[PDB]
Amino acid sequence: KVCHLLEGEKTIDSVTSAQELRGCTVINGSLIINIRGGNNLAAELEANLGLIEEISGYLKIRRSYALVSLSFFRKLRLIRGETLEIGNYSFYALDNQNLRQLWDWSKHNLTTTQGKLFFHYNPKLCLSEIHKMEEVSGTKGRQERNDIALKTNGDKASCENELLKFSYIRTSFDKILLRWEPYWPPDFRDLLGFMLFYKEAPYQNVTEFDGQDACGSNSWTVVDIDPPLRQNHPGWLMRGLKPWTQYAIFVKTLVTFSDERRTYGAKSDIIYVQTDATNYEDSAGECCSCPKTDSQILKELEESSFRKTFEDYLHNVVFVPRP
Amino acid sequence: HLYPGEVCPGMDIRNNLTRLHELENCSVIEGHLQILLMFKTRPEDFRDLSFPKLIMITDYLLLFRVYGLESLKDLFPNLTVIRGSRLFFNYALVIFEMVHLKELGLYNLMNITRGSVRIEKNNELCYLATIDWSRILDSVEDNHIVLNKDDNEECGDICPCPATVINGQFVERCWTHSHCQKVCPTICKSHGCTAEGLCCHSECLGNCSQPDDPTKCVACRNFYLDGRCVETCPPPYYHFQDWRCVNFSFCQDLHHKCKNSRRQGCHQYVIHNNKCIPECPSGYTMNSSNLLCTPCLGPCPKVCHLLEGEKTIDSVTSAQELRGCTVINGSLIINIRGGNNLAAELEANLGLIEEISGYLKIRRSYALVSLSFFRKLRLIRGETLEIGNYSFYALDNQNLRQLWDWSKHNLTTTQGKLFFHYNPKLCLSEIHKMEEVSGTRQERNDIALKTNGDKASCENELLKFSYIRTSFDKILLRWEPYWPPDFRDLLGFMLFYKEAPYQNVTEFDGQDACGSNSWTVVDIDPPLRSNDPKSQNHPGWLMRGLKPWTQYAIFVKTLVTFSDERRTYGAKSDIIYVQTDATN
Amino acid sequence: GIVEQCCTSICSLYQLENYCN
Amino acid sequence: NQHLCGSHLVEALYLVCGERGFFYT
Ligand SMILES: *[C@@H]1O[C@H](CO)[C@@H](O[C@@H]2O[C@H](CO)[C@@H](O)[C@H](O)[C@H]2NC(C)=O)[C@H](O)[C@H]1NC(C)=O
Ligand SMILES: *[C@@H]1O[C@H](CO)[C@@H](O)[C@H](O)[C@H]1NC(C)=O
Ligand SMILES: *[C@@H]1O[C@H](CO)[C@@H](O)[C@H](O)[C@H]1NC(C)=O
Ligand SMILES: *[C@@H]1O[C@H](CO)[C@@H](O)[C@H](O)[C@H]1NC(C)=O
Ligand SMILES: *[C@@H]1O[C@H](CO)[C@@H](O)[C@H](O)[C@H]1NC(C)=O
Ligand SMILES: *[C@@H]1O[C@H](CO)[C@@H](O)[C@H](O)[C@H]1NC(C)=O
Ligand SMILES: *[C@@H]1O[C@H](CO)[C@@H](O)[C@H](O)[C@H]1NC(C)=O
Ligand SMILES: *[C@@H]1O[C@H](CO)[C@@H](O)[C@H](O)[C@H]1NC(C)=O
Ligand SMILES: *[C@@H]1O[C@H](CO)[C@@H](O)[C@H](O)[C@H]1NC(C)=O
Ligand SMILES: *[C@@H]1O[C@H](CO)[C@@H](O)[C@H](O)[C@H]1NC(C)=O
Q: How far apart, in whole angstroms, are the C-alpha atoms of residue B237 and residue B249?
A: 10
Query: CA nearest B318: which of B271, B283, B365?
Result: B365
Among positive and negative, which fits the CA dihedral B224, B227, B231, B237? negative
Q: How far apart, in whole angstroms, are the C-alpha atoms of residue B335 and residue B167?
A: 35
Helix (H, G, I), strand (E, B) or coil at A131: helix
Assign residue B409 a region (left: φ > 0; alpha: ψ between -120 and 50; beta: otherwise).
beta
State the DSSP string of A59-105.
EEEET--SBSBSTT--S--EE---S-BTTTBSEEEE--TT--BS--T
Cα-flanking dihedrals φ and ψ of residue B353, to 5°? Answer: -65, 125
State the DSSP string of B462-495.
---EEEEE--SS-EEEEEPPP--SSTTS--EEEE
Q: How far apart, in whole angstroms, are the C-alpha atoms of residue B109 and residue B116?
A: 13
The contacts found for B301-308 with CB under 8 angstroms, 24 or more apart, are B301/B326, B301/B327, B301/B354, B301/B355, B302/B326, B302/B327, B303/B327, B303/B329, B304/B328, B304/B329, B305/B329, B305/B330, B306/B330, B306/B331, B306/B332, B306/B358
Contact D22 B121 (CB under 8 A): no
Determine whether A112 is exposed, middle or buried from the number of CB atoms within 10 Å of its CB (0-12, 13-18, 19+).
buried
Q: How far apart, in whole angstroms, are the C-alpha atoms of residue A302 and residue A257?
A: 10
Q: How far apart, in whole angstroms, are the C-alpha atoms of residue B569 and residue B431?
A: 13
Our measurement of the distance from residue B492's CA atom to the centroid of its chain's CA atoms, rounded to an integer in Å, reads: 40
Q: In what order do the strands lie in the sheet with B81-82?
A: B6-8, B26-29, B56-57, B81-82, B111-112
- Strands B540-543 and B475-479 turn out to be antiparallel
For chain D, the domains span: 1-25
Is residue A21 within 8 Å of residue A33, measured between CB atoms? no
Number of H helices, E strands in chain A: 3, 18
State the DSSP string of B110-134.
-EE-SSEEEEEEETT----TTS-GG
Query: CA nearest B522: which of B547, B549, B546, B505?
Result: B546
Is residue B129 within 8 Å of residue B157, measured between CB atoms? yes
A210 Cβ below 6 A of ligand 4: yes
Is residue A151 within 8 Å of residue A124, measured between CB atoms? no
For D2, the closest chain C residue by CA position comes to C10
- CA–CA distance from A61 to each of A91, A118, A303, B178, B360 (Å)? 8, 10, 34, 66, 38
Among positive and negative, which fits the CA dihedral B59, B64, B66, B70? positive
- Strands B327-328 and B238-240 turn out to be unpaired
Q: Provide CB contacts within 8 A for B396, sequence distance 6+.
A: A261, B363, B364, B421, B422, B423
Candidate from B16, B39, B97 with C-beta closest to D14: B39
Q: Provide CB contacts within 8 A for B541, sequence distance 6+.
A: B476, B477, B495, B522, B524
State the DSSP string of B18-71.
GGGGGGTTEEEESS-EEEEEE-S--TTTSSS----S--EESS-EEEEEESS--B
State the DSSP string of B182-235.
----SSSSSS---TT-----TTEEEEESSTT-SSSEEEESSEE-SSSEESS--T
Is residue B165 within 8 Å of residue B134, measured between CB atoms? no
Determine whether A250 is exposed, middle or buried from the number of CB atoms within 10 Å of its CB (0-12, 13-18, 19+).
buried
CB neighbours of residue A132 within 10 Å: 18
Kindly list the structural domains of chain A, giving each domain's residue range(s) and its CATH number in brackets, ordered by start.
2-137 (3.80.20.20), 162-275 (2.60.40.10)
Give the closest-approach CA distance of A301 to chain C in angstroms. Answer: 20
Q: How far apart, in whole angstroms, are the C-alpha atoms of residue A68 and residue A283?
A: 18
Q: What single DSSP character describes residue B406?
A: T
Q: How far apart, in whole angstroms, are the C-alpha atoms of residue A264 and residue A157?
A: 10
Q: Provide CB contacts within 8 A for B61, sequence distance 6+.
A: B32, B33, B35, B79, B82, B92, B93, B94
C13 in contact with A at a CB cutoff of 8 Å?
no
Our measurement of the distance from residue B340's CA atom to the centroid of its chain's CA atoms, rounded to an integer in Å, reads: 7
Query: CA nearest B129: which of B110, B157, B152, B154?
Result: B157
CB neighbours of residue B408 within 10 Å: 7
Query: CA nearest A87: which of A129, A121, A58?
Result: A58
The neighbours of chain A, by the rule of 3 or more Cβ pairs under 8 Å, are B, C, D
The best mutation among A4, A7, A78 to test binding of ligand 2, ranked by most ligand atoms within 8 Å of the C-beta, falls on A4
- CA–CA distance from B432 to each of B119, B404, B406, B572 (Å)? 44, 12, 11, 19
Query: CA nearest A115: which of A97, A149, A91, A137?
Result: A91
Give the closest-approach CA distance of C8 to chain D in angstroms. Answer: 7
Query: CA nearest B305: which of B284, B319, B322?
Result: B322
Q: How far apart, in whole angstroms, are the C-alpha atoms of residue B488 and residue B477?
A: 24
Name the β-bridge partners of B66. B38
Q: How far apart, in whole angstroms, are the C-alpha atoms of residue A66 and residue A104?
A: 19
Query: CA nearest B365: which of B373, B357, B376?
Result: B373
Is residue B524 within 8 Å of residue B494, measured between CB atoms? yes
Is residue B77 within 8 Å of residue B49, measured between CB atoms? no
Q: Please, which residues 151-180 of chain A have a Cβ atom closer than 8 Å to chain B?
A: 152
CB neighbours of residue B55 within 10 Å: 23
Ligand nearest B37 Cα, by number? Answer: 10
Q: How far apart, in whole angstroms, are the C-alpha atoms of residue B2 and residue B186?
A: 25
- CA–CA distance from B379 to each of B282, B354, B355, B414, B433 (Å)? 16, 7, 5, 7, 16
Query: CA nearest B179: which of B300, B72, B30?
Result: B72
Query: CA nearest A163: which of A252, A235, A268, A271?
Result: A268
Nearest residue (CA) to ligand 6, atom 5: B209
Q: How far apart, in whole angstroms, are the C-alpha atoms of residue B486 and residue B336?
A: 41
Query: CA nearest B86: which of B278, B316, B336, B351?
Result: B316
- Strands A221-225 and A191-200 turn out to be antiparallel
Name the β-bridge partners of B402. B370
- E strands in chain A: 2-4, 11-12, 26-28, 31-33, 54-55, 59-62, 78-79, 91-94, 111-112, 118-120, 147-148, 166-171, 176-180, 191-200, 221-225, 235-238, 246-255, 271-274
Number of H helices, E strands in chain C: 2, 0
- CA–CA distance from B231 to each of A63, B221, B222, B235 (Å)? 63, 8, 5, 13
Is residue A37 within 8 Å of residue A58, measured between CB atoms? no
Is residue B245 within 8 Å of residue B225, measured between CB atoms? yes
Q: Provide CB contacts within 8 A for B520, sequence distance 6+.
A: A37, B496, B497, B498
Helix (H, G, I), strand (E, B) or coil at A194: strand
Query: CA nearest B65: which of B42, B97, B33, B40?
Result: B97
Cα-flanking dihedrals φ and ψ of residue A78, to 5°? Answer: -150, 130
B207 CA from centroid of ligand 6 (Å): 6
CB neighbours of residue A145 within 10 Å: 7
Give the closest-approach CA distance of A97 to chain B in angstroms. Answer: 9
Secondary structure, 3-state, B238-288: EEECCCEEECHHHHHHHHHHHHCCCCCCCCCCEEECCEEECCCCCCEEEEC
Q: Provide CB contacts within 8 A for B346, sequence distance 6+.
A: B316, B319, B334, B336, B368, B373
- CA–CA distance from B167 to each of B148, B171, B372, B430 (Å)? 22, 8, 35, 42
- CA–CA distance from B486 to each of B556, B566, B567 (Å)? 20, 12, 9
The best mutation among B83, B190, B220 to test binding of ligand 1, ranked by most ligand atoms within 8 Å of the C-beta, falls on B190
Q: In what order do the strands lie in the sheet with B412-413?
A: B303-304, B327-328, B355-356, B379-380, B412-413
CA A230-A233-A238 angle, 5° bins: 130
Q: Please, which residues 57-76 of chain B have a Cβ atom closer than 8 Å to chain D?
A: 65
Query: CA nearest B334: which of B306, B360, B353, B304?
Result: B360
Q: How far apart, in whole angstroms, are the C-alpha atoms of residue B354 and residue B361?
A: 16
Ligand 1 atom closest to B221 (CA): 5
CB neighbours of residue B393 within 10 Å: 21
Q: What single DSSP character describes residue A190?
A: G
- CA–CA distance from B203 to each of A108, B114, B135, B221 (Å)? 78, 18, 18, 6
Determine whether B18 is exposed, middle or buried from the number of CB atoms within 10 Å of its CB (0-12, 13-18, 19+).
exposed
Q: How far apart, in whole angstroms, are the C-alpha atoms of residue B257 and residue B273?
A: 22
Q: How far apart, in whole angstroms, are the C-alpha atoms of residue A261 and residue B575?
A: 39
| Torsion (CA) B252, B253, B258, B261 in degrees, nearest 10 | 110
Query: CA nearest B136: which of B91, B90, B183?
Result: B183
| End-to-end CA, chain C | 15
Is residue A177 within 8 Å of residue A237, measured between CB atoms? yes
Q: Provide CB contacts within 8 A for A212, sequence distance 6+.
A: A42, A68, A218, A219, A220
- Strands B540-543 and B520-524 turn out to be unpaired
Helix (H, G, I), strand (E, B) or coil at A24: coil
Is residue B343 within 8 Å of residue B369, measured between CB atoms? yes
| End-to-end CA, chain B | 83
Q: How far apart, in whole angstroms, are the C-alpha atoms of residue A157 and residue A123?
A: 7
Cα-flanking dihedrals φ and ψ of residue B373, to 5°? Answer: -65, -25
Q: How far apart, in whole angstroms, are the C-alpha atoms of residue A170 and residue A276?
A: 11
Q: In what order do the strands lie in the sheet with B492-499?
A: B520-524, B492-499, B551-559, B576-579
State the DSSP string of B314-356.
-SHHHHHTTSS--EESSEEEE---SSS--HHHHHHHSSS--EE
Query: CA nearest A273: which of A163, A161, A179, A162?
Result: A179
Q: How far apart, in whole angstroms, are the C-alpha atoms of residue B556 and residue A181?
A: 52
Q: How many CA atoms lie within 13 A of B366 on its CB side?
A: 15
Is residue A91 within 8 Å of residue A123, measured between CB atoms? no
Q: Provide CB contacts within 8 A for D15, sequence distance 6+.
A: none
Cα-flanking dihedrals φ and ψ of residue B205, to 5°? Answer: -135, 135
Q: How far apart, in whole angstroms, are the C-alpha atoms of residue B341 and residue B346?
A: 10
- CA–CA distance from B405 to each of A251, B350, B370, B409, B566 (Å)? 48, 17, 9, 6, 19
B205 Cβ below 6 A of ligand 1: yes
| Chain D residues near residue B39 by CB distance under 8 angstroms | 14, 18
Q: How far apart, in whole angstroms, are the C-alpha atoms of residue B492 and residue A17?
A: 18
Is residue B229 within 8 Å of residue B220, measured between CB atoms? yes
- E strands in B67-108: 81-82, 91-96
Q: How far apart, in whole angstroms, are the C-alpha atoms of residue B283 and residue B272?
A: 11
B157 in contact with D at a CB cutoff of 8 Å?
no
- CA–CA distance from B327 to each of A157, B199, B284, B308, B332 (Å)? 42, 48, 14, 16, 12
Name the β-bridge partners of A267. A252
Greatest Cα pair distance in chain B: 96
Our measurement of the distance from residue B106's CA atom to the centroid of its chain's CA atoms, rounded to an integer in Å, reads: 26
| Chain C residues near residue D20 by CB distance under 8 angstroms | 20-21
Name the β-bridge partners of B571. B461
Q: Which amino acid is at A210?
A: D
The neighbours of chain D, by the rule of 3 or more Cβ pairs under 8 Å, are A, B, C
